[PDB]
Nucleic acid binder design. Structure first.
Lengths: 99, 49
DNA sequence: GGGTATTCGCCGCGTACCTCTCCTAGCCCGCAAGTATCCTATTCCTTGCAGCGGT
RNA sequence: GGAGAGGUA
DNA sequence: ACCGCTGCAAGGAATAGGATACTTGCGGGCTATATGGCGGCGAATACCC
């Protein structure tokens, strides 16, 4: 923790203090690769989730019964709010946020 | 502590390790699931997946 | 008004069994335990007043 | 009693 | 029948030691912000006459 001085310009030190604060307990991993939680050693499997980035997907003509496709483009962030652009059957361009 | 312990102890991806073989352990540590938080649900997943 | 198209929202998605784990969050107030402190004694010295022999 | 995971036919 | 004396308390300097006010972490006791599913269908708007 560092304390500035109010009257002095932005950027200055009146006095700075620090200490070793405890926080949390992270379980460790045995030699084999299995955690022990409550005498019931468990394992964590990996996940196969779709990657962040951009995807230009489309629907295979399963809407409007007109045989007309509708391309759409999605931006998927790693942490935040998504974003989508879509084409209405009338060739408009619609944004859509978090559905 | 709560935020980490709840994940490690009770999640959809920290599962009890069946241990009735060497092979079961080895093939369970290499599993590649697609369910869980951020994935697709078990019972409403299409066929193309 | 009126016939029509388009959208929104609700309803639904197999049976039976076995194994395991985990089940609210945060504040608060009494309360046990452990402690630093304060009053309690002893030994030395130099005063201030009441008895007291003596004449 | 309720959830989650895995398994058998 | 008056007095200076002895003597017996009251307040200063040096050590040991328990009592006791003070501080603290707890244990139980209580209160109160998602984003990979379609298909059918019927009601509720939209629309352009």
């Amino acid at each position: 923790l560092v304390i500035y001085e109010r009257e002095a310009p932005e950027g200055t030190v009146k006095d700075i203090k620090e200490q070793e604060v405890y926080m949390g307990e992270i379980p460790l991993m045995t030699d084999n690769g299995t955690f022990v939680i409550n005498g019931t050693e468990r394992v964590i499997v990996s996940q196969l989730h779709r990657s962040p980035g951009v995807f230009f997907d489309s629907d295979k003509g399963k809407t409007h019964s007109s045989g007309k496709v509708l391309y759409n483009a999605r931006i998927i962030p790693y942490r935040g709010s998504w974003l989508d652009f879509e084409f209405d059957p009338k060739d408009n361009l619609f944004v859509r946020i978090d559905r | 502590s709560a935020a980490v312990k709840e994940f490690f102890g009770s999640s959809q991806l920290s599962q009890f390790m069946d241990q009735n073989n060497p092979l079961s352990e080895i093939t369970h540590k290499r599993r590649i699931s697609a369910l869980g938080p951020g994935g697709l649900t078990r019972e409403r997943a299409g066929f193309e997946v």
